[PDB]
Amino acid sequence: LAPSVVTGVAQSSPLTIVTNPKEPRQPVPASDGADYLKTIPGFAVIRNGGSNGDPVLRGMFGSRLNILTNGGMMLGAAPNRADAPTSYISPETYDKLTVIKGPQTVLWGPGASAGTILFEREPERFGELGSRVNASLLAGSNGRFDKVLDAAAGNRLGYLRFTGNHAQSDDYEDGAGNTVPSRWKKWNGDVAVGWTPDEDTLIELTAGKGDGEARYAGRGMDGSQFKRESLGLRFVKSNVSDVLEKVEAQVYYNYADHIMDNFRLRTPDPSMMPMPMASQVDRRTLGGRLAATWRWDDFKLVTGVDAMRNEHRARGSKYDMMTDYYTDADQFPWSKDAVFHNYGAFGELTWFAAERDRLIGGLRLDRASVKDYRQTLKHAMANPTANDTRADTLPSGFVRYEHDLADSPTTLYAGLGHAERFPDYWELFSPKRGPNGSVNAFDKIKPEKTTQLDFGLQYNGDKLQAWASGYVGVVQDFILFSYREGMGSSTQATNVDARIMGGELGASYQLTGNWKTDASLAYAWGKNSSDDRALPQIPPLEARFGLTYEEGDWSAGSLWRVVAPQNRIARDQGNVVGKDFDKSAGFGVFSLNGAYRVTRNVKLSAGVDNLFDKDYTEHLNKAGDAGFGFSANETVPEPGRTFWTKVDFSF
């Protein structure tokens, strides 16, 4: 029971990773969804500024990742993806994080081409009147503090629970002594009312809001509001019969209301946005899920349907140059531009054939649709697709086979999976051109259809615990973005065919009773088959080595992160956020941490991130901004040396 600081999370079982987001983590996260993925091999993070990075899994970006909060979806609204889904998610407020790698599940919605990421909160169940609380307080270099509170009280016929957080940090500095434009502020508060009329039933009401700020060194505008409101309803009846083992039903409402501007966290420079300017955009998502679990004999079957509708609006500021009067964005009416629908049916079937063999297969069928509400485009021109609808029905599915060896505690696995994903908001509305000879992006961007083989192994010995996961795949009609400066600067979305391949592996050895040593490796590769080029924004080879000493009451450990250069890039190509420009330099970062359990109710941890004050940037981080004094194409640098300490109470 020696307490530790997390520097990496293992594959505890084929393709799936499970972690507790309320334990301290070595390179210390913002209150950010993406930063809590940095400990899971396979993930990289596009740096935008201080917080709210854009997470990338085995080279893949964006909606190729299903990131659900409590089974529900939270979608932001900036055409920038300045408020990416994970900018609204504060992971210390949830109880469990779970990553399913590859297109190997169909329970959690459509388009899960790269992987599935589930943040969830667990129901409370008192057996009598009682009340537990969990809190944490953290403080660190450059004015970072994070405060989180999880309090609940109840009895056997119900409970009520409050979960909140407050977190911020000033601008950090790099390994060369410069202030990076990067400060941020975040808070959330969500309440849950839970009714438990017997030992099998649970109805839960949930409501919560949150807001935040964030200065972005990588952008021309900052996030001055990340307002979120959400509602939810859960139903869990258990053991309805000998065969129906669970029936779960849920509905969710998430509303995002974002503001980008160039005057509240910065000042307009000379550069093609010299005037004070702001843009307010919002996204209203409503959806539900309904699933029955059948368990009998050697079979488990999960059957269900789900649905989702979401709607996007925008409205912008207006600044008069003769009078220098600024009219804020909220003085103008809302302009709807997009509405999306998805309805889907799914099943997934597991066969427990003997104890050393399992075979899992799953299928789902989705009907996805979108309607363009833009009467005009922006000087305003008439929108050639104003009020057009497109739809499509996309089947997806997978089979996976897991076999355990007879002599050693080893599990081998191989799975083959197919994902079909209707296009994004950002892939359909944000690009200023479609494929060549096309009206718009909206009418010609084809859905992305990826087909991939997953394989790997698990091994759990007494002194050794190791895992490996490799993949090779093709992506048909990959949605790629191309950048050119010309009038001004503009993107074009196209559909290409892509080969991709890579993997991750990790191992932990227990040397002494007190010494542990772990390591992990992550490799991602991509090729644009249609132009005999490499795929853009692909993170380079990355290993992490770690040694820690435990002693019952406390623990100390060190960590080395080592990343190769990246030499395969596709210049002026990427996603809606970033573009490849230059090859990248390798680098190494070494860090220290420690943890001490003061008593059963209080724990202590601390660490030094980047001990040797390395000045370095990651291949995926955004470029500079010129307005912030950034050069030719300097990508935003990582933090330099940083100190932090955190106390955890639990009664």
**Which of helix, strand or coil describes residue 85?**
helix
Spell out the residues 6+ positions from residue 171 whose beta carbon is closer than 8 angstroms to its own.
Answer: 50, 142, 179, 180, 181, 182, 183, 215
Q: Give dist(CA 548, CA 495) in Å, integer.
A: 47
Resolution value (Å, 1 decimal): 2.9
Q: Which amino acid is at 7?
A: T
* Residue 369, both tokens: 């649709």
From residue 530, alpha-carbon distances to 20, 434, 477, 480 in Å are 42, 17, 10, 11
From residue 194, alpha-carbon distances to 69, 201, 232, 308 in Å are 18, 10, 12, 24
- Kind plus residue range of the DSSP H or E element containing 647: strand 642-650
Considering only CA atoms, give the Rg of the chain.
Answer: 24
Nearest to residue 42, comparing CAs of 5, 88, 20, 11? 11
| Alpha helix positions (H), 535-588 | none
CB atoms within 10 A of CB 634: 16
CB atoms within 10 A of CB 602: 14
Residue 374, φ and ψ in degrees, nearest 5: -80, 110
From residue 101, alpha-carbon distances to 113, 404, 513 in Å are 9, 20, 33
Spell out the residues 6+ positions from residue 525 whose beta carbon is closer than 8 angstroms to its own.
Answer: 59, 500, 501, 502, 538, 568
Domains and CATH numbers, the chain: 11-650 (2.40.170.20)
CB atoms within 10 A of CB 420: 25
Q: Give dist(CA 10, CA 404) in Å, integer.
A: 18
Q: Where are the beta strands (DSSP E) in 31-157?
A: 43-46, 54-57, 60-61, 65-69, 72-73, 96-101, 115-120, 130-140, 144-155
